Amino acid sequence: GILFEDIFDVKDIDPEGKKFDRVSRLHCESESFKMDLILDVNIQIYPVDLGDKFRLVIASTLYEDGTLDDGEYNPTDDRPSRADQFEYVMYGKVYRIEGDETSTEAATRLSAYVSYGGLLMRLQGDANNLHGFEVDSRVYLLMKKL
Amino acid sequence: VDTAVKTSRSGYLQRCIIKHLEGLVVQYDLTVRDSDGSVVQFLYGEDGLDIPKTQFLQPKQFPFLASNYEVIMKSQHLHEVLSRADPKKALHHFRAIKKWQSKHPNTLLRRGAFLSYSQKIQEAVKALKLESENRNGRSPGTQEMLRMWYELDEESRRKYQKKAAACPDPSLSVWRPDIYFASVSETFETKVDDYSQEWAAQTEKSYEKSELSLDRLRTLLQLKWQRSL
Amino acid sequence: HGAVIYATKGITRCLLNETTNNKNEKELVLNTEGINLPELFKYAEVLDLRRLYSNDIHAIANTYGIEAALRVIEKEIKDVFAVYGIAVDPRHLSLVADYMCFEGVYKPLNRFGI
Amino acid sequence: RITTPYMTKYERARVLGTRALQIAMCAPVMVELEGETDPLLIAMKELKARKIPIIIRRYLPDGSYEDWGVDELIIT
Amino acid sequence: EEETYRLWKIRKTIMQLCHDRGYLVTQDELDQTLEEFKAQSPRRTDLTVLVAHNDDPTDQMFVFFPEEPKVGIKTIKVYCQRMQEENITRALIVVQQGMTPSAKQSLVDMAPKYILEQFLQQELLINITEHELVPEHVVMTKEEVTELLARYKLRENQLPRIQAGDPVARYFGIKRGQVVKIIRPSETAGRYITYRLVQ
DNA sequence: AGGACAGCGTGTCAGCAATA
RNA sequence: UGCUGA
Lengths: 146, 229, 114, 76, 199
Hints:
part of a larger assembly, 5 chains, D: 76 residues, Eukaryotic RPB6 RNA polymerase subunit, elongated, E: 199 residues, alpha/beta, Dna-directed Rna Polymerases I, Ii, And Iii 27 Kd Polypeptide, Chain: A, domain 1, 2 domains, 4-stranded mixed sheet, 6 helices, 10 strands, 32% helix, DNA-binding, RNA-binding, DNA-directed RNA polymerase I subunit RPA1 (chain C), RPABC3 (chain A), DNA-directed RNA polymerase activity (chain A), NA-bd_OB-fold (chain A), DNA-binding (chain A)
């Protein structure tokens, strides 16, 4: 049920200068794909630093066995094989997909904006591998440092 | 001190105003009449459309009505009103207006039948009128045009008239905005055209599925106008 | 002191406020502090006599008619409210101006108007 | 025959008021009330069911009038 | 040679005024420049124009440009004779300083037999009808006013009034009792239409 | 008929004492 | 008429 998987590395910890309290906006950049990631992460729970790697996955289900998710949260669920190889899991919805600006050029790149309650992420890169996304679609953002 | 004095004057100003404009109510024929029937306005705001309801009929608020289209039709107008609407009388009027304004880009150019029969101007100035004076003050060359036009033209097929006729009168004037669908103001339909053209060219590059068509958005806006009346 | 060499009736001083626009900054305006509409008609080639404006509303109503004084009334009320950020909807000023100018003249909204 | 087909808000208000003042004066309720003691709630219940035999007589500014039925009037 | 500029402006304005009333005027007269006006025509008796009406070819109008800066009763009679003999009914007297006050009630005294009308020369230097704020006026026909009164269930009184001395009722030559349609270019509704009874 | 002028006008909102 | 409250 994965829509995207990659190994990023943090390049900038907060360039814009807007600074929130417990949230930090990481500007990463993929390896072997040259995809770009802007990611608001709660750093009180999950400290992140510069020059740090992490395996990042976006999914539509946590079960990794096909069964869809029901949209209800039970902390009592008896299926416990949901992806737990990951330290930081989020859960948001994609709210904007916008093909890149360049006209007269191939420019078949897409920017997918995901909201995780209030923590935004933007995945930018070749459209070929951002097809699984679509506006109003719920997705999980699993992460695991390396 | 200024507060006290200002309020003292404002109270009197408002009392006078309220004591003169109090009997003006909108009638069942949409005309603003006084107590004795004297017509003050033939349409309230010059288009009807009381103020509080015209807040979202501004452009720049259509991308909101378009996004929330399903809720707006279910919650208010519903599929019932959209299909109980017949827009032909008003739609044809706007087509006529558009054709006219297409044939006359400059609407301050002195249209006239005889004025339209000044294209022979060169035909006359070449050789015909070269010999005269200002007979009765008009010209030596104007009299040739008067003679050629006056009775040396067809009886009923000298129809330079149609090429020079008035713009159809505005729709709200002829087609009763309340009971007539699609009869809106000339400044609203321009906005709706502009937005439909700038919205059919956004759906093309949208990466989100839109299940609304330009001609359902048009009916939505026309109903939302007809109901803010 | 009250002996004046020569003056246009009603005009006390002119002045050219160089710029009035950013969109088409090239605009120039010949503002005045008096009011004589006909004594400007002679300069239809120096100045634009369409776009002529005055705050008098009785002089406009005498040189251009009452349907032209309606809009001066509306614009005057709007510009009076604008200096404070207030903004009354045009549908109200339209009705006030249509009632004031109902019977062909600019009639006051006061004890002699009733 | 030429006025608007819908029921203006002032007409709804006056029709509800009159139907309520009638119900309160012991008039038969054609709406099958279900335990409510307010005559205005009953009048709204009747207006929603399209059971009000009243004739709105819209007056034009010259004395001419048009008689509409409360049933034949689009309540928004 | 500023007298010629004034004469040319007044003649252009009177040609526009005669075209707006529905008289047969050619494009060249309405688009005549100064260099060609002065080429054609110096005087103030060969500026007199005689114009015909679209319909009713007998119905023509005659524009005067008196020499006397202050026209009087005798000046009025001298060309009321011209009108009576040439068999015309309407006239238009452009005066340079005014009319002596008795003359204004004489022009009024001449019954529909010979209806005249005066215009100051400073009133014709520009076409007020071409101002931004002045809407378009249209004299309604006797069969459109009836349909208006029937549609709105009106009476002819109980309608807004336009003064008979209004600078745009004097220009369009509208007699009393006539209703004029007015197309206001409105920023709110585009092309609002109003009606005013001339009185 | 150029004035001189005498002549009407209004003025947000409720309480208490107290006294005509 | 002197006070007072928005």
